[PDB]
Amino acid sequence: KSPFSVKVGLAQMLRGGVIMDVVNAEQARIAEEAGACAVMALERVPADIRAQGGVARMSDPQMIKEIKQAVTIPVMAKARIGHFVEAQILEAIGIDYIDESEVLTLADEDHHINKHNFRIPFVCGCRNLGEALRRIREGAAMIRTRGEAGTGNIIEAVRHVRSVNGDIRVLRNMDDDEVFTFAKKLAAPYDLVMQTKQLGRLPVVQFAAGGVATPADAALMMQLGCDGVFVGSGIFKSGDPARRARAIVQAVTHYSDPEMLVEVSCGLGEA
Amino acid sequence: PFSVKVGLAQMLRGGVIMDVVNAEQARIAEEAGACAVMALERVPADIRAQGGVARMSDPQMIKEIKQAVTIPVMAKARIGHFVEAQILEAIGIDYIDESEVLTLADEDHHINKHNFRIPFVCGCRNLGEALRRIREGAAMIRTRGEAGTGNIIEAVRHVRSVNGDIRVLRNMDDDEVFTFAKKLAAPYDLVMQTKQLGRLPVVQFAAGGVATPADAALMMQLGCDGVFVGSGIFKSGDPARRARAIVQAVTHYSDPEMLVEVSCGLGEAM
Amino acid sequence: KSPFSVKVGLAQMLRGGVIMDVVNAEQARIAEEAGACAVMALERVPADIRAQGGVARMSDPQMIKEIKQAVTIPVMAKARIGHFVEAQILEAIGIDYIDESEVLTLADEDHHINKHNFRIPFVCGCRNLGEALRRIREGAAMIRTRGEAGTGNIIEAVRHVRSVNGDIRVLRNMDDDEVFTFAKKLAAPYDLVMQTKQLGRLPVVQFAAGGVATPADAALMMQLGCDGVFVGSGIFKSGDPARRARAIVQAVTHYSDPEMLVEVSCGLGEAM
Amino acid sequence: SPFSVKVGLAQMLRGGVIMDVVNAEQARIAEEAGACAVMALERVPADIRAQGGVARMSDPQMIKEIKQAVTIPVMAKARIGHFVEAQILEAIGIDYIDESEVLTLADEDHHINKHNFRIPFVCGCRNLGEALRRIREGAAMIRTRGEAGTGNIIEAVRHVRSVNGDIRVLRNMDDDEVFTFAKKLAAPYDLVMQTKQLGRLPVVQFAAGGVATPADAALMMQLGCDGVFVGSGIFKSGDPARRARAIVQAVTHYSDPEMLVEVSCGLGEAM
Amino acid sequence: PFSVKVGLAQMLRGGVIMDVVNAEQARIAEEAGACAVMALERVPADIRAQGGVARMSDPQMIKEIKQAVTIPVMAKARIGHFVEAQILEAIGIDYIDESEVLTLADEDHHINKHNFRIPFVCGCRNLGEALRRIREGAAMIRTRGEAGTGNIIEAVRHVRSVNGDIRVLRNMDDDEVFTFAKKLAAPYDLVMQTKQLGRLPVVQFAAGGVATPADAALMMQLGCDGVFVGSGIFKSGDPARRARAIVQAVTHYSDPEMLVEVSCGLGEAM
């Protein structure tokens, strides 16, 4: 079994879960108590990063350690795209996942982190199938839609989810002789394209992220065929986080049960 | 059956649907003689004024409005957000408006409304839009107009566009209908059904900017089956009497004497 | 049960066949003896139309009757696009199929013939799935690629075959909720799009046409998923049409047998 | 055959000249002058350019006559994308198929799926990305497209230099930057890495297009090609029998200017 | 001799150069282990924030900083302002940075640095720029980056551009180097010297936006000989410990465990 396939298997254990952005140990315990499958440690949530500006970097290791010691579920953390030394530091803290994240300030305009040089799994974002496969070829063990972080607006995540899944479906019936050109037009490595055609799905876990604000948003992503969701700003920037976090966890667990979605949405407060 | 939902929506023909935000408003609308109410948390004029993401309303406040009236209760879902619509159906309301006044959720696809048991309303700007919404499962169509402005001009453009093309279609050479359907980017079979009926195959309401009884009666005389009014009532001085005035204007849209009576001293519009 | 279903069913008999353009009863006899499934009677073959210019119309009923009397296989004839009276005339002659053909001079730039008003089946051309479905809804019982007629160059027919079958394969697997927008973007009738999605193929017989010059060209169209091929100029604008006609019939029959394809290509004389 | 077995067959053409021929008479001259293979076609590229018309696979009959006339390997052209023309050629029993841009393009968007065949293919290219895409489709040998039928080596020199230049760029490139380089070449990443590891093209690489003189042929070899194609330059000149030997000797002794002089002296009218 | 100045600058390989504004800061920088200090009156982030014309610093304040430390002292002169550089040399400092962070003084020409006894630093964005600066007499090169922002992205682009072209040059066919020098608009002889050495013929530091120890170590792993830090230290909470942290990160740029230690609880960056 390859070290990459082992990393792919680790991320498969989050299948069906919700990953919540947290900024302190208290928020972390709330997220775990509600049933988050993992927490994303950061010092400014995406809606704050947008509203404030300035350079957004890797979080201080000290605060990430506090979150790591406050929960038993997996802890992720963001590194800037291309900042392989920030990833080296996060890996040395002993967290479980690195998100090479477009919500932080781009560090390398032309290249991402070479993720195969690391032991621990990476998440990367994408807007289309070609981007996803390029990130995977670089070593991402898990893929999320980029969406539009910090807006509470689901429209871009829906577009990205549909783009990726729609091109996957196209790929399944496609004449094999046409797959070479299709790989060229996606600027994607052909072997990952054929692997995707063999599986009928993305070769790694695919979560939705960016703008998921409500239980209905979360279940919509799942019915569009994601394996889980990230929620960052939509929980703690609301008036009632500890109850809304549970509602979104419930909505991902029972995403095809409208009676359940009604119950968890009722009197949930201002989003 | 789609034809059952289409027939259900015919009960609204001749009525006014009013946007409401609480049980107090919902009763006023029912008292004035509204044929249905549209539950939401933010009226369209406040959505345009404040901005932000506008979504489906809290199930709780919709339940309150539902328990407070006997007339049918509608609610809005974002375009393409079929799970918001699943929740609305599970609340037990009567109609879902897949609404352009809320923030778009899917830029490329609307809800597959045939997957639902309860009827949908959709907006349109022209006959091709209306027909595509209907083929998707809309049981009722409203003009898009320009919600929140109190300005009737876009609703007039959309009404005239839909009815004008239906009137053109009615007399068109049969052989030319294939090309007409292509140019409308509308399904040919619904186009011929429209040609044979000589009107839209579902109930067609006016919406967007209806501010006065005269606006409401104008939409009726242009050939609509009814009108929506959201901001025009509850963004004005006296909504309780302005609501009844619009109901009267729709019921008596060809009686100028009646329109004068309900317009006189009506106060101040939005 | 429906009369359109009957016409669609009738054209099933051409599956696996070659349809040859002919300009006289002698060419028709050669086409039938070589194994054509049908002949297409016209006064000028597409390569001559292309080279000479002038207005190209329906052929004289007299020469169409002569071809109809010379063979027992079905006889087709071309009408100009939109010329429903040329089609009335051809139907009244008693031929078996009308091809509303882009190879003749366009008669109506905005409308095709309303083919459901007719008793006999029509063939129409297309370049993509939207065109195909629009022709079908107008009443075409059978579809062919447009290709590029009269050139002996298959590049456009390959593009059209791959475009139609490629979109059909995309449609087959598509999320149902997305098919409405797909139909909008094809400018195609939604119900025919959904029918195409359920079958996994075009609801009617689908032939390749335009530029098929060699046995290898014809077998290539069959391997790309066509039901048969039209050949006009490739056969009679060449050195030995009687032998080349045989070879293209055999190539379509044996399209997946390279040893056979070698046999019928070998020493076949100059192509167009 | 396995891909490596096909790559091995083309390797034994190293250091040779492949000559276009139109009859058994031209075929024997080519073999007797020391050609390493002959390319069977019914019109040389200089005549296809001049006369126009659709250019297709040659008649199996004439290909067979050439195949019997010589003992060296026999190649033939198929139009790009015309996989049935390639099925016929393979069934005739020749040794290589050239999926050739000098014939009329049959499929504008896709090349033949060359892995579906037993016998090796040659494909043309103008740059490294093109070469690697053809290889991934199954070509076992690459030639520069050059500019066929003009007797002008300028395009062939550009293509040789572009391919070899980008190969040289690969050798010292940072490993992390190779993913973006593969994207920019629109080429599959693993063949880019293979090219990086070999320091050369993963298949035999010949020059073709406008080779008219011994000096042109030795020039292509000195720029680092494994061999050359010559079509028009030989049998569209004054003495082809002697010019053919002179070009064979120039490729065998491409670094001996004294020999290059001897075979150029009094060689007659080039095309 | 140019080669004497080039050799002098090699003593800085492996170090951090810190911008300072007084003797207090200068000592802190020396205490933390800086290899040199860059005296100026306004740090780059304040130049971008306040505007105005930015010139050579007062000789007096440079003298104070010079008398306060033993490590080499650099100072900035405006690009093309060879008389500002004459004054800096006459003060007796160790290095002049012909600096793009100060207001340009000559749009078309840099200083003829070979006319000077003491070594110069110049910025660059690509290999052609570096080589032209070196031919003019620069004994040391830094990336231009984007000074004052705390953002590493332009420095990464410039480092990768310089090193990537050097790596391309190393393996290039000799015959193609003439055209390569033309396209770089760089002197051919320095290009071949670079090709033969396989690296820049002078010390190459990173500068512009280095805010954290991780940024500093990233520049080193990309192949720089050292780093400049101006605003990143003395526009933050605790500069005395952040300064030592960056020194440690440069000295131990391949030890992730060390980078964690010096980054932990480091406070708040600019």
Ligand SMILES: *C[C@H](N)C(=O)/C=C/OP(=O)(O)O
């Ligand atoms: C990377 C970060 N955890 C993320 O994915 C943010 C999501 O968008 P948001 O709108 O903040 O939930």
Ligand SMILES: *C[C@H](N)C(=O)/C=C/OP(=O)(O)O
């Ligand atoms: C969807 C909503 N019920 C509606 O129709 C909006 C009407 O526009 P307004 O200007 O608020 O009357």
Ligand SMILES: *C[C@H](N)C(=O)/C=C/OP(=O)(O)O
């Ligand atoms: C309508 C005509 N018989 C046809 O189908 C086209 C023939 O084109 P060609 O390229 O001559 O085979």
Ligand SMILES: *C[C@H](N)C(=O)/C=C/OP(=O)(O)O
């Ligand atoms: C495919 C053909 N034999 C070839 O490789 C190119 C020959 O071109 P020319 O310019 O005639 O030597």
Ligand SMILES: *C[C@H](N)C(=O)/C=C/OP(=O)(O)O
């Ligand atoms: C010329 C000055 N010493 C310098 O290199 C500026 C660096 O940029 P900063 O963002 O202030 O570290």
